[PDB]
Enzyme design. Sequence first.
Site, PDB file in Angstrom:
ATOM      1  N   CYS D  58       0.806  -1.223   0.000  1.00  0.00           N
ATOM      2  CA  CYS D  58       0.000   0.000   0.000  1.00  0.00           C
ATOM      3  C   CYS D  58       0.842   1.277   0.000  1.00  0.00           C
ATOM      4  CB  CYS D  58      -0.941   0.013   1.207  1.00  0.00           C
ATOM      5  SG  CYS D  58      -0.035   0.074   2.777  1.00  0.00           S
ATOM      6  N   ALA D  61       3.292   1.430   2.914  1.00  0.00           N
ATOM      7  CA  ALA D  61       4.470   0.602   2.691  1.00  0.00           C
ATOM      8  C   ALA D  61       5.442   1.390   1.816  1.00  0.00           C
ATOM      9  CB  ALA D  61       4.076  -0.707   1.997  1.00  0.00           C
ATOM     10  N   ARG D  92      12.420  -4.819   5.935  1.00  0.00           N
ATOM     11  CA  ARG D  92      13.250  -4.428   4.804  1.00  0.00           C
ATOM     12  C   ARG D  92      14.666  -4.192   5.333  1.00  0.00           C
ATOM     13  NH1 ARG D  92      13.204  -0.114   0.022  1.00  0.00           N
ATOM     14  NH2 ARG D  92      14.023   1.187   1.729  1.00  0.00           N
ATOM     15  N   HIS D 191       5.366   6.435  -2.735  1.00  0.00           N
ATOM     16  CA  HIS D 191       6.688   6.982  -3.076  1.00  0.00           C
ATOM     17  C   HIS D 191       6.530   8.471  -3.355  1.00  0.00           C
ATOM     18  CE1 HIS D 191       7.824   2.901  -5.180  1.00  0.00           C
ATOM     19  NE2 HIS D 191       8.048   2.835  -3.880  1.00  0.00           N
TER      20      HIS D 191
HETATM   21  S1  CFM Z   1       9.442  -3.942  -4.043  1.00  0.00           S
HETATM   22 FE1  CFM Z   1      12.309  -1.491  -6.228  1.00  0.00          FE
HETATM   23  S2  CFM Z   1      10.914   0.174  -6.814  1.00  0.00           S
HETATM   24 FE2  CFM Z   1      10.961  -0.015  -4.541  1.00  0.00          FE
HETATM   25  S3  CFM Z   1      11.050  -2.372  -1.096  1.00  0.00           S
HETATM   26 FE3  CFM Z   1      11.512  -3.526  -4.773  1.00  0.00          FE
HETATM   27  S4  CFM Z   1      12.017  -3.570  -7.010  1.00  0.00           S
HETATM   28 FE4  CFM Z   1      10.265  -1.966  -3.254  1.00  0.00          FE
HETATM   29  S5  CFM Z   1      14.419  -0.538  -6.034  1.00  0.00           S
HETATM   30 FE5  CFM Z   1      13.465  -0.527  -4.005  1.00  0.00          FE
HETATM   31  S6  CFM Z   1      14.695  -1.301  -2.206  1.00  0.00           S
HETATM   32 FE6  CFM Z   1      12.787  -2.476  -2.620  1.00  0.00          FE
HETATM   33  S7  CFM Z   1      12.797  -4.628  -3.272  1.00  0.00           S
HETATM   34 FE7  CFM Z   1      12.900   1.116  -6.015  1.00  0.00          FE
HETATM   35  S8  CFM Z   1      12.516   1.566  -3.814  1.00  0.00           S
HETATM   36  S9  CFM Z   1       8.948  -0.124  -3.450  1.00  0.00           S
HETATM   37 MO1  CFM Z   1      10.778  -4.449  -2.159  1.00  0.00          MO
HETATM   38  S1  CLF Z   2      -3.469  -0.787   3.837  1.00  0.00           S
HETATM   39 FE1  CLF Z   2      -5.596  -1.650  10.696  1.00  0.00          FE
HETATM   40  S2  CLF Z   2      -3.626  -1.898  11.882  1.00  0.00           S
HETATM   41 FE2  CLF Z   2      -2.006  -1.872  10.280  1.00  0.00          FE
HETATM   42  S3  CLF Z   2      -2.343  -3.797   9.006  1.00  0.00           S
HETATM   43 FE3  CLF Z   2      -4.323  -2.887   8.292  1.00  0.00          FE
HETATM   44  S4  CLF Z   2      -5.890  -3.724   9.718  1.00  0.00           S
HETATM   45 FE4  CLF Z   2      -3.860  -3.909  10.759  1.00  0.00          FE
HETATM   46 FE5  CLF Z   2      -1.422  -0.219   4.604  1.00  0.00          FE
HETATM   47  S5  CLF Z   2      -1.847   1.636   5.895  1.00  0.00           S
HETATM   48 FE6  CLF Z   2      -1.854  -0.189   7.270  1.00  0.00          FE
HETATM   49  S6  CLF Z   2      -0.975  -1.963   6.079  1.00  0.00           S
HETATM   50 FE7  CLF Z   2      -3.884   0.592   5.589  1.00  0.00          FE
HETATM   51  S7  CLF Z   2      -4.072  -0.674   7.518  1.00  0.00           S
HETATM   52 FE8  CLF Z   2      -3.279  -1.944   5.764  1.00  0.00          FE
END
Ligand code: CFM
Ligand code: CLF
EC number: 1.18.6.1
Lengths: 522, 259, 260, 476
Positions: D58, D61, D92, D191
Amino acid sequence: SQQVDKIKASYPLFLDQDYKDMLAKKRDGFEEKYPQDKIDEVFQWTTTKEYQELNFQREALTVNPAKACQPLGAVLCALGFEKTMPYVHGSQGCVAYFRSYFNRHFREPVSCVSDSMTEDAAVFGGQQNMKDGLQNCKATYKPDMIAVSTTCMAEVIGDDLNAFINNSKKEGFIPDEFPVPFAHTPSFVGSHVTGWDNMFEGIARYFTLKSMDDKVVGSNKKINIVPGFETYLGNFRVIKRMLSEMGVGYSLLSDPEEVLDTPADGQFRMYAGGTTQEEMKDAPNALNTVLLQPWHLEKTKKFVEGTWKHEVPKLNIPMGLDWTDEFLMKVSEISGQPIPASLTKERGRLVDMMTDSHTWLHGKRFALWGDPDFVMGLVKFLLELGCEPVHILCHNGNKRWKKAVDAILAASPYGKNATVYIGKDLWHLRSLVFTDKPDFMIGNSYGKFIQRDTLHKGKEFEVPLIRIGFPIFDRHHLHRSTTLGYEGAMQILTTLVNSILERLDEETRGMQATDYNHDLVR
Amino acid sequence: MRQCAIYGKGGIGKSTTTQNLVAALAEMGKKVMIVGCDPKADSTRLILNTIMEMAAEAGTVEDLELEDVLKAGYGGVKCVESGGPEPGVGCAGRGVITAINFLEEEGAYLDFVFYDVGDVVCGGFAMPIRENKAQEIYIVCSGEMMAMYAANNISKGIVKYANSGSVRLGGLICNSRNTEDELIIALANKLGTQMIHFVPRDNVVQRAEIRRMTVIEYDPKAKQADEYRALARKVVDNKLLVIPNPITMDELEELLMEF
Amino acid sequence: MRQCAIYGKGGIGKSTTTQNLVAALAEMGKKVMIVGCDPKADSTRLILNTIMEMAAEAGTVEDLELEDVLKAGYGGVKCVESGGPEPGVGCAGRGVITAINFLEEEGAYEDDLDFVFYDVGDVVCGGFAMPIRENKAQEIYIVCSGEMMAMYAANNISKGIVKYANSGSVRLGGLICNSREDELIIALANKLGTQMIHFVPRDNVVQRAEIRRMTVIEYDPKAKQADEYRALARKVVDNKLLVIPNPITMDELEELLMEF
Amino acid sequence: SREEVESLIQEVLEVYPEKARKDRNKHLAVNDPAVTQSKKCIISNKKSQPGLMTIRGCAYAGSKGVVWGPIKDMIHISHGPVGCGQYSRAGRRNYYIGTTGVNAFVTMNFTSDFQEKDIVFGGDKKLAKLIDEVETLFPLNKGISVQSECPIGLIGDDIESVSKVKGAELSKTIVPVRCEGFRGVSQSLGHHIANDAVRDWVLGKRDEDTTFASTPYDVAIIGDYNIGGDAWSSRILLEEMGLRCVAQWSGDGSISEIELTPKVKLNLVHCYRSMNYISRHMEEKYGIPWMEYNFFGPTKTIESLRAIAAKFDESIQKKCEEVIAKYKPEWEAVVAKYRPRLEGKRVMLYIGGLRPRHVIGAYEDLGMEVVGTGYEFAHNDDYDRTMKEMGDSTLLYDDVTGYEFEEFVKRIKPDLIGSGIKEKFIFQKMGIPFREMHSWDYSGPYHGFDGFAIFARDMDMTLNNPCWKKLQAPWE
Ligand code: CFM
Ligand code: CLF
Ligand code: SF4
Ligand SMILES: [Ca+2]
């Protein structure tokens, strides 16, 4: 540089002189890093009792939690049913994370879908997502059942799961008779364990609420067993083993032991084993229902006592000697089957092990944490071993739980230097092992960082982690262990004495310094 | 440019007076835009494609084109509707939040911008009055128990955001029920503000409403039309912007007991 | 044990009529419970610590006792207020969900009542539709006026009913009009396929009582308006017409209005 | 293989309901390296079809997990319920040097752990209090970020006002990021939101400031998250080439480095997808030019070094040839040892928004061909760049479902697969060698010359491992 026949990965590559020098230029030149003397001063202060008062005075900040959110427990509960796809209504980020989290712990594939609710579904409601999502999941992954839980976003906006699923069936997205149990699982209430309870109750409801008129208690002559949030495969196995050993007819409600442990034989099996739909439908006909983790199976208990009319026994988790004895005798009482010679002998072998190892276990002080049932059974066992469970932390525990565990501590001389902390996190515990240092910590993988911090203060202040709980991400195949029964108690006992002996051998390995006590026999 | 937000109980004709007020504004030669942020009413039907519905047709809000959501009507007044869910589902608050962000980032902003906002039942309906948004707030009410209770409640919201940032109460607008006039002046004084204008209940308003027009469009030479012009001029020239001081339920009841 | 939900435009007298009705109902000897779920109004002030405020104070809903939230008032009417944030912040919708859930879980509905009345706010989200989900309110009454925005609101609510009706057991019991407006609302109902259960006339006594924290029944049992609420109460107690409404267009609405 | 992949695509899609069938069809394709424009071949960055087991994350993330999280000396707050924060806590491997809990805070999880009352009453007062608590408990932090989780975005919590008032008061830079998980369709919009939060609250802090001593050779690594030490293994080369690397974006990055980045002469962009936004911004506001580079494998590292050095003078270009020659014996040793062990092997990849095209050259330096590749969240401009780097009749897949990937693998039968943790144990079960191309399967680096040694070592240990010969029982 890299020598082709002795290739270095990150450790020890960056410890080479050219990298170490480059890193130093990055720091002095562009990082504007606080002087090491200041970094050293602040660290020592984060170790003091003064810092600890401040830490415990927090009311808004949470640092390094010892719990997760409801839906995660919901996914695990749903995985315990035959050919079912855990479905989480709400945004997809949650699902990617749930799957990743369980993958890393079980080292297995974990199947779960979302209906990918986006910004416009947050504004319009997730009804369309639920219609198409249920249709796509059924058509693509072909489960016999879809168990629906929710993410916070869907909970905030009040998406009525019951109406959304009924309209899905009504409009022809999924068959009217296709099983789709649901449970509202708000992230902002309870923790992952609450999610398990809500989901189990939601499935129990689905299969039995309407059908209660033709049910007779004790007519199928089995005992239902509801496990709760369980991540040790050996715990499903030991309970199934002990009951079969007794000749006790049982039905284990939510059994993910097979899906979470399929064979690498050339084919991927998305579904394996599990509690059948008929075992859930026939569940009210059982003699009674035993909840293995009662402190987080409260909503389930109320549905079982309320609707199924079963007199659920007041039984604690079967961990340690006493509670395993109580469990077996209650199961004996209810089924009419006597406790066999095999189990009687197994019990004496655990007592044997206790008498062999008590010397090293006596007065050993422990900091520990986990979910309420696990951490409570652990306290009790530790106490039966002559150990002192000094710091007991259960982030997701409640006030009645703390009372119950204080009562257990009151019943023994080994729980007198012990305090229970609910709603406190691992940063709170980090302080506790600094100000009132125990010998070891018994917890999950997050405690490896607390060990790192205690070691930075000095070797003498280092408090080693004994990995028992969830999640264990930095060791392999520990998810195959047993924590329940005598079998689980023997495993736990061995790990504790050997962690003690491992540590002693370490502190006594110094040549001409401390090795006068580096004994061959211990 | 002046950004203004209009709040107040809806069952009065809050959106109707908002559109009539702008109509007269346009007639004065002022360039205005109306941003509809009220799920219980249609803030542009009298002057004349919501942000949410058009965002869905394009995929997401990021694919949205300000041109598919804007549209001019009487006197050139620009009109956009935030959109929201069908009754009983979704989250109308987020719909306002999304709408407003799109407008900021797509630089949709002209003399006045008027937000016709819904009840402040949550955070999203206060977005129009956050930092760098509406600076002047007008509350339309009447001498009805709960209509006044609504204005006082809104005032409590204005206080939270006024203490935080820069937004003030410009005054009370009384939509007459023909019962009153003095009562609202008394409330405003209690609040520490002013009754910017008393809007009489002329049936022409309703005649225009059914024809989908403001009074200024339907029949300019009408008597009610001048009232909206006087409301417009007062708002154009208003300098009284304050942080209200909401009253207690006891104080409102006591006030009503005097009339 | 009939659970009813009351929706409608607030600028009318939605909360006041709900309370005058429940007072007449309690006066007939009916055991009633009022559940306030409207952030834009005070739903129990005329009959008499919200669930949300009490919860926060105690830690969480799970720590809440029903006796802390339920309070008996006039005629023995039991009152509960959901509670919610202060203006312009928080999420009142979720507050409603939480409160109803608490009431369900704490066995408040299983005490032997004759009626439960939810005084709901504008359905701007799923949370304010909590009262009309399954196992909740089966009868919906909308308070309306001859005003346009007031009838349009009546329709929006009907559309919301339709949605939860096709999914479960919830019907529109009818229209209640707070004062040829008498005829207008009758036609609006015929169009919807329901009825105008009662026309509450305009009477200064309602305000007199209201400003003094009372319903007319308590304020002046002998008043003529008092008998109006007793007439509404009887029509509700004997009502059998529950329907799924057939919402109209704003065009069809401007037609109905333009015809009067 | 030319029409066998098109009939494969159609055969795979046959299992979906009609609506999902027509949408997934345009998200899958076969490559034609003559297609400079990928939009008539594949569409991307559209929402995921519900219930089809997408691999996507998401916006949170994308913001907290990948862009802000790595910045070591700031305290990043996962604002909302306990979940997001816990699952993304140290998942990560964005490496850093620092004393954690004192002056660095990357592996830690700070949350506001929302309860019901914070949802109903709002959490701005709680946030304000939390900020005062991270100040007394973590006095050495150099800034704070507030990372929104779903609930914050619905409830309308005015977090920028809190950030403004607390920041001015405490004399701290507090960054509010509206990265609630339901926004957008993946990690990608996260991003973007993060890049915008950087420019609006951190980047221009040292604008009127002329204290920094500039050099004509100043550069910034933009978009290298230091997975397994990837960035350190990249800047060793850049600095041996005579350049001064003033900043590392996010990987082992500090707030001061970010503030100092407008002072450089060139922005070297590795991850185009996550940071092209801030780079483009730095070009229009500060005039700093940017260029894309690839440090995966020798052919690409050498090419990159040459292009980067060509933007400077003859002394840097001379040092560039010095470095290429220095490492030539080393990477040729790796090729001589492992390439014969790996030649002709086929790889299918499915990663994020950069690796699916970026690791291709490195695989080809070992004689391996990538027969399938795909992205979870890339835009068409990434797919434009993907056509040149892939072979002709190969499979291309955007936002692949669990079903599609499994079946494509069953047809094609690759010798090795490179994707994430959510698909790792699926294919090992199926007897196919798997390497995590997100976390490097806890190995790394893979960037630069020293990283290539580890990459080859790793592909070899997994592909030619003795366990793969034992999946089937001798008695069946
Ligand atoms: S899945 Fe990179 S656009 Fe982003 S965490 Fe992985 S192929 Fe990411 S290279 Fe990077 S350090 Fe990454 S590997 Fe760009 S940062 S959202 Mo999951
Ligand atoms: S898309 Fe609410 S507490 Fe955090 S995992 Fe969720 S049920 Fe549990 Fe992205 S911003 Fe977060 S991981 Fe929104 S909630 Fe999922
Ligand atoms: S009260 Fe507001 S923030 Fe909460 S679900 Fe409803 S519209 Fe959304
Ligand atoms: Ca495995």
